[PDB]
Amino acid sequence: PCCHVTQLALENISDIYLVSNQTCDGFSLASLNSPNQLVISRCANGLNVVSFFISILKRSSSALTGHLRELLTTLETLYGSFSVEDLFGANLNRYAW
Amino acid sequence: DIRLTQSPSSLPASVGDRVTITCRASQDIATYLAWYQQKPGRAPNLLIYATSTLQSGVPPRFSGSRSGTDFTLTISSLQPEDFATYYCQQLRTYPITFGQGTRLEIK
Amino acid sequence: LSEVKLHLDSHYTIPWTELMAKVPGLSPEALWREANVTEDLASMLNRYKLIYKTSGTLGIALAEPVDIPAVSEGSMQVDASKVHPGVISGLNSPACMLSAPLEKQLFYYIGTMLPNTRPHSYVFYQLRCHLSYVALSINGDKFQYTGAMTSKFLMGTYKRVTEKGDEHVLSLVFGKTKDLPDLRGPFSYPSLTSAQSGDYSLVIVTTFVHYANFHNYFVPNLKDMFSRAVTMTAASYARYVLQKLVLLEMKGGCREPELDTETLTTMFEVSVAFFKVGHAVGETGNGCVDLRWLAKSFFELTVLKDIIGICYGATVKGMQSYGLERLAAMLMATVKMEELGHLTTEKQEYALRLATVGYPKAGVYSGLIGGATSVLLSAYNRHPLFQPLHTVMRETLFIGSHVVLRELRLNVTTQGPNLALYQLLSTALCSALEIGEVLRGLALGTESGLFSPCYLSLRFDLTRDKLLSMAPQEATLDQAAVSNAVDGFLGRLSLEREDRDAWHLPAYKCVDRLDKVLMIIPLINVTFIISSDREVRGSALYEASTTYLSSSLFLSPVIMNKCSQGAVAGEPRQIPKIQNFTRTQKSCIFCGFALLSYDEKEGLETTTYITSQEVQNSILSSNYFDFDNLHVHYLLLTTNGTVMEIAGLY
Amino acid sequence: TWVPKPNVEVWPVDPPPPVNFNKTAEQEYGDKEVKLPHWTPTLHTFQVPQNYTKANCTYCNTREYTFSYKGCCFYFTKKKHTWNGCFQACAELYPCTYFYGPTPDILPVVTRNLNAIESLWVGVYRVGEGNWTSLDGGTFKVYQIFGSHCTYVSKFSTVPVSHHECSFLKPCL
Amino acid sequence: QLVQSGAEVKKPGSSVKVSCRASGGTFDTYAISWVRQAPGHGLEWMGGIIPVSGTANYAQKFQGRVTITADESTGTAYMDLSSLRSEDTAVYYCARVPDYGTNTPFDYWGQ
C-alpha cells in the first residue's frame, strides 16, 4: 500500500514497517502505524526514519547489545543500497514544511 | 543591452555522462536566467531557472546553477532520447526576453 | 520514551525505557522533531540539491608516519591529575605520562559543536560534546573563524559577514572517516569528500551560492593541505606553521590582514596543528606518552599561541593541562639556572623546553633569563670566532631565546644585568659572516632566517645600505630576492616597533637622541655609548681618530650607570696608543674587557667580549691584528672607564 | 700593570617561587565545564533622510512630461545616481527623486513612457523596520527579498521591488 | 487552472493546428505571453509584453497585434494577426508565465 500524499510523537506510536524499493512502487516509504487498534497508518519517509535510527544507534553504540549491533549493520548498506539520488512517482503539489 | 552567448557544441557527448553549457555575455545587473529545452518539432519546456543567487525547481533532475559572471546547467544524462536544443533566457521575473541558440546532439 | 517494534524485510525492538540510563544526555524526542519524518519527497529533492557536491576524490595512498615513541627503559606512570612533589628526580630520570587523564585535562570544556544555523541544520544533527576552539576575527568582525575541535575530528567555519547583514559560511570537517558526524536525509559522505587517504577524509559542507562567493577570492589546495596533514608529524607540523607565521610577521604581514588564499589556509593549518597533537595524545588509547615528545609538542604549541595572539588577536580555549605544567615546573626547579651551560646539548634543549612549558606566563618567574644567558655564554665560549652559527647551536639558541624575548616585551623588569649580558653576547655574535648567512636564509626561506643572535643584539647601526653592501657571495642568491631579504631584516630590526629598545637598560636616559647611536656596550660597572653626535651625557668623552669624511664615532664611558648632569664640553680627549705588546700573555688578562674593531670609512666592523683565557688566546694567535691595512683600528675598552688603543705588536 | 683578572660569570638569580599542589580543577581552569563557541557580531550603518524634504504646496496641473517648470510627476534623465545622490534631487523643488513620489496608480503612466530607460530608481526607501514610507506615508506595498534600502521599477514591473545593490548606476527620472 | 487559447484572422495561409492550449500543476502566476519564432531563430516576442491573466492581454513592443479576454482560471487568450502579409508566417507559441513550473504549449503554423 504505497502512499502518495498524506499530511506524531514517539509516545503515541508503537509500530513501524520498512520495505525495500522493489517491494514499494519504486520508492522507500515507511508507515508509522500507531497502536482495529491501528488508529493511523501515516506514510512516513524511509530515508529520514532510517537516518534517525542509524544516528541513534551510532550515538548509543557505547552500550549496544549484539542484536542491536547487527541491526545497525543491516540498516547500513541498506541506506546505501537505496542510493536514491532521484526517484519518480507520486506527483502532487506542496506549500511548505 | 544585456546579451546571452552560449558555446556551440558538436560532440555527441557519448551516451552516459553529464553535460555543462555556459551561457554568459557582458555583465547582467537585474535579470534572472531561465532554461528552455525543446526536442526537434516540439514545444519548449521550462527547465530550472537561476536568478544568479538561487535555482528554481522542476520535476526533471536538471541541476543548473550560475556563477558571479557565468551560468551553467547539468543534466547527468546524455541519452539520445534527450538530443534536444537547450535555450538560456533573460527575464526579470515573468517576461523571458532574450535567448541564444545551442546544440546538444546525443548518440 | 516507549518501545518500537521495528519491522523490515525481520523484527527488532528498541527499549528506549532502559537505553536512557545507559547513555546519559541522549534526546530521542528532539532528534525525531529535527528529522521531520513527515516530509514530501519534493522537499527532500529541493533541500538535497541546495548543498554543493564535489566529485573526484583523488590524492589517495598517502604515507602515515610514526609519532608517539614506545615506552622505553623503566619509566613509571605519572597521572595527569595527581602531580605530587615526590614523583621523579630530574632530567636524567626517564618518565612517562598517562593518556586518559591527560586527554580529560586537554578537553575539559563542553559546548555545542554543530550549531543550529541554516547550512548546518540541513545536513548534520545537533551535537554537544567536549571540545576546544581557536577563534579569531579580522576586519572589524567582518570576517570570523571558529576552529572547534574534538579528540576525533576537526571542524572549521569561515563565517564572513558582508554588508546588509548577510553572511557566508563554509565548513572543512577533517578527521577519520569512521568518526565523522552523522548526516540526515538523502545525504552521504562519499558525495561530499574532496580528498581521502587510506583512513582519512576531508569533506566540505556549503551551499552553491556560499561556495561560489568563497570561490570568488579563496581557492583551496585541499589535496596539498591534506597530504601535509597526513604525512607530517605533530612537532614538525607545528614547527612548520610557526616558521611560516614568523616569516609572515615581518614585512608588515600581520599588521593588517588580507582576504586571499594564503591567510585562510594558514588559519586552517593552525587549527590542524592543534588538532594533530590533540588526536595523537588521544589516539594512544590508555597507554603512555614519552615526556620528551610532550615537552617538544607543547613548547611548539605555546610558541604558536604566543605568535597568533601577538599578530592575529586570536583566542584559544582549552588545549592546556595544568598537570603537565606542574610536572615541568617541578622538574626544572631542581636544576640550577647558573649551571645550565655545563650540560649536554640535548639535555640543555630539554631543560629549556621544560622551563618554557612550565611557566607560559610572563613575569611569574624571571630566573630563566639566567639559565638562557649561561647557555648562550657557554655556546659563545665554545664557538669559533667570526664564524656563522652552526645549525644545532642555532636551534638551541632559538629554543632558549623565547624567555628573553618575553621578558624584553614587558614594561618593568628586574633582571637587568642578565639581560645586558645576554644582549652583549648577542652583539658579539653578529659578525659579517653571520649577517650574510641570515640574509641568504631569509632569501631562500630556510631555517637560517627564522632565528639569529642578531635580533636581540644591541647593534643599532645596521641600516639597509650597510646590509646591502654585504650580500652573500653565493651566486648572488637570486639577485632580486636580496631586496626582500634586506626589507625583512629591517622590519625585524625596526626600532620604533617590535619593542626592541633600551628602556630596561640603565643609563639610557642620558642619550637624548635615540636615532644617532651606533651601539651600546654594557660592561660591568660601566656602559659605553657609541654615537656620531656629542649631545650625550656621561662621565667622559672620547673621539676616535677617524677620517674627516665619516662619522665621528664618539665614545662616552658612563661610570656606574650614573648619567651626568650635562654633556662634557671642551675638546674631547684622544685615545692613547700602546706601542709595545708581546702576544703571549700567559696570565689571564683582559678577562672582562671588550675589544672593538672599526674602520676609518666603513665604520664599526666587529666586536669581541673577552670572557675567558680561551677567547684571548684565539684573539691573539689568529690574524685579527692585521696592521698592514691602514684603515682598521682596535680599541680596548677597559672596564676601568678609559679607552686605550693598540698600536702594534712585536 | 695588567693585573690578572677572573673570568666572566653570570649574575646570581633567586630560587624559583614554590608551586602549589592544592588548586582545584575548577579553580585552575575556567571554573565552568559548560561553555559556548565565541561569536563576534558586528554592526552596520543605516539610511537616514536629512536635509531635502517635501516642499510647500504645488504649482502643477496633471501627470505629464515636459523639460520645463511644468509637470506634476515627471523629470529629466539624471544619468548619474546611486540612490544616495539620487536622494539629493538636484532640481527646482523636487518633492522626491522624481517630482512626485511613486503611487499605485501613477505607475502605468511612467511605465508607458519608459522607452530604453528600463532601469530607474524610484524614490522609496525603508528605515530598517519595513513599512516603506518615502515622503508621504501610506506604507506603499513592495515585495522583495534581495535589497535593503533601494527601490526600482521597470516596464514589466508594477509593485516596487528592491534592488539587490545600491552602488549601481541607477538613473533617476 | 486550465486555459484554452488560439485564434487567427488574416487572408493567407491554411494555419494547420490553429487551436490548442493547456495548463495545470506546479505554481500559478498571472499573465500569458505569446512568443513568435521564425525558423532558424530562438525566440522573438510579439505583443505579449503586458498580459493581465491566464487569458493574456493586449501589448505591443515593435509590432501590431491584438489580444482579448483576461482570466487567470479558465479564460480564452486568443489572438488576431493584423492582416498577415508577406513573410512573418511562422510557428507562434504561448506561455502561461507561471514562473515555477511554467507551461508552454505548441500551436499555430504557416502556409
Side-chain angles (χ1 to χ4, degrees), chain C residues 37 45 59 92 110 117 149 176 181 183 207 235 276 281 298 313 369 390 427 432 470-471 513 521 535:
Chain C
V37 310
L45 286 139
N92 307 354
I110 215 177
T117 182
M149 323 146 46
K176 287 225 197 323
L183 299 311
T207 76
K276 266 174 94 32
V281 175
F298 278 69
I369 314 189
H390 201 24
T427 302
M470 43 188 306
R513 271 311 283 281
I521 314 200
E535 214 33 70

Side-chain angles (χ1 to χ4, degrees), chain A residues 8 10-11 14-18 44-45 47-49 51-53 55-56 58-59 63 67 71 79 97, chain C residues 1 5-9 12 14 16 22 31-32 35-37 39 44 125-126 182-187:
Chain A
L8 247 193
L10 274 308
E11 194 247 328
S14 151
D15 198 1
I16 170 158
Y17 309 99
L18 266 153
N45 298 354
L47 261 282
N48 287 2
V49 160
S51 152
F52 152 79
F53 272 103
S55 152
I56 276 304
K58 282 220 296 171
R59 290 193 190 207
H67 193 208
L71 172 57
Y79 173 142
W97 94 277
Chain C
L1 91 169
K5 175 100 164 164
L6 210 154
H7 282 298
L8 88 166
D9 222 328
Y12 300 85
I14 294 198
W16 273 318
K22 280 176 129 46
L31 284 178
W32 185 287
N36 79 227
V37 310
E39 207 200 76
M44 288 197 212
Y125 273 6
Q126 283 281 147
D182 296 6
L183 299 311
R184 69 181 205 130
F187 286 109

Side-chain angles (χ1 to χ4, degrees), chain C residues 167-170 172-222 224-234:
Chain C
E167 292 94 327
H168 286 93
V169 197
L170 212 63
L172 272 147
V173 198
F174 171 93
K176 287 225 197 323
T177 325
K178 81 212 63 170
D179 303 328
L180 289 168
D182 296 6
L183 299 311
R184 69 181 205 130
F187 286 109
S188 53
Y189 272 139
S191 150
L192 288 168
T193 88
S194 151
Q196 173 163 19
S197 151
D199 222 325
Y200 280 64
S201 313
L202 181 96
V203 314
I204 174 174
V205 188
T206 168
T207 76
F208 280 104
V209 51
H210 292 339
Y211 177 51
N213 200 231
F214 285 132
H215 199 288
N216 298 334
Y217 53 85
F218 166 50
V219 80
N221 203 345
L222 302 187
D224 195 327
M225 334 171 45
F226 179 70
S227 34
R228 299 199 43 74
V230 181
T231 325
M232 256 167 159
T233 85

Side-chain angles (χ1 to χ4, degrees), chain B residues 38 42-44 46 55-59 87 91 93-99, chain E residues 26-27 30-31 37 41-43 45 49 61 93 97 99-102 104-105:
Chain B
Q38 50 144 8
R42 216 154 301 207
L46 174 96
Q55 184 184 193
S56 95
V58 199
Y87 277 110
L91 83 175
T93 320
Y94 287 61
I96 275 145
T97 313
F98 220 123
Chain E
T26 74
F27 143 85
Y30 83 84
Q37 158 179 337
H41 295 18
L43 47 90
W45 266 28
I49 306 98
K61 222 202 271 310
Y93 303 84
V97 200
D99 251 343
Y100 225 57
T102 311
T104 325

Side-chain angles (χ1 to χ4, degrees), chain C residues 183-222 224-261 263-301:
Chain C
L183 299 311
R184 69 181 205 130
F187 286 109
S188 53
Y189 272 139
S191 150
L192 288 168
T193 88
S194 151
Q196 173 163 19
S197 151
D199 222 325
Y200 280 64
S201 313
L202 181 96
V203 314
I204 174 174
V205 188
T206 168
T207 76
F208 280 104
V209 51
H210 292 339
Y211 177 51
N213 200 231
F214 285 132
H215 199 288
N216 298 334
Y217 53 85
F218 166 50
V219 80
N221 203 345
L222 302 187
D224 195 327
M225 334 171 45
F226 179 70
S227 34
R228 299 199 43 74
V230 181
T231 325
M232 256 167 159
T233 85
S236 43
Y237 201 100
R239 177 54 83 85
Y240 141 74
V241 181
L242 162 67
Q243 285 174 13
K244 165 156 51 188
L245 255 178
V246 153
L247 259 280
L248 197 37
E249 165 77 77
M250 329 164 175
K251 318 141 185 288
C254 287
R255 172 221 319 130
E256 84 298 327
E258 290 82 67
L259 301 192
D260 71 4
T261 293
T263 56
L264 324 181
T265 320
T266 46
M267 321 185 147
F268 189 72
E269 310 292 343
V270 167
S271 324
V272 176
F274 280 81
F275 161 66
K276 266 174 94 32
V277 179
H279 196 13
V281 175
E283 239 170 37
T284 301
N286 312 2
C288 266
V289 197
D290 207 21
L291 197 51
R292 281 93 63 78
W293 186 89
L294 275 184
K296 191 163 162 185
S297 318
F298 278 69
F299 161 74
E300 304 291 338
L301 287 202

